[PDB]
Amino acid sequence: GPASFLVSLASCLALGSGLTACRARRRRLRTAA
Amino acid sequence: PCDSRGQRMWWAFLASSMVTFFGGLFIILLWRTLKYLW
């Protein structure tokens, strides 16, 4: 139980961090364009 | 075959759920107390 919950939490946090990082550089690095 | 239940081991699922819930509560309370006690 707890191990699966921790795995799901870590996966969700990693996915959120990756999506935020991808969107951040997609937006700033192309502010002029 | 059939009739695969000779006895009951219902405690396993209940123990897993209870340990998950109570471990979450205990770790949250420990985090709160550690923040309180720096």
- Judge: B16–A1 Cβ closer than 8 Å, yes or no: yes
The answer to whether the beta carbons of residues A1 and B17 sit under 8 Å apart is yes
Smallest CA–CA distance, residue B15 to chain A, in Å, is: 10
- Both tokens of B27, joined, read 């770790």
Report CA dihedral (B28, B30, B31, B33) to the nearest 10 degrees: 120
> From which experimental method does this structure derive?
cryo-EM
Query: How far is Cα A7 from Cα B4, in angstroms, rounded to an integer?
Result: 33
Helices B11-36 and A2-28 pack at an angle, to 10 degrees, of 50
C-alpha pair distances (Å), B25 with each of A24, B1, B7, B30: 35, 43, 32, 9
Q: Which chain A residues are closer than 8 Å to B23 by Cβ?
A: 2
Map tokens 């799901």 to a residue. A8
Q: Which chain B residues are closer than 8 Å to A1 by Cβ?
A: 16-17, 19-20
Smallest CA–CA distance, residue A17 to chain B, in Å, is: 23
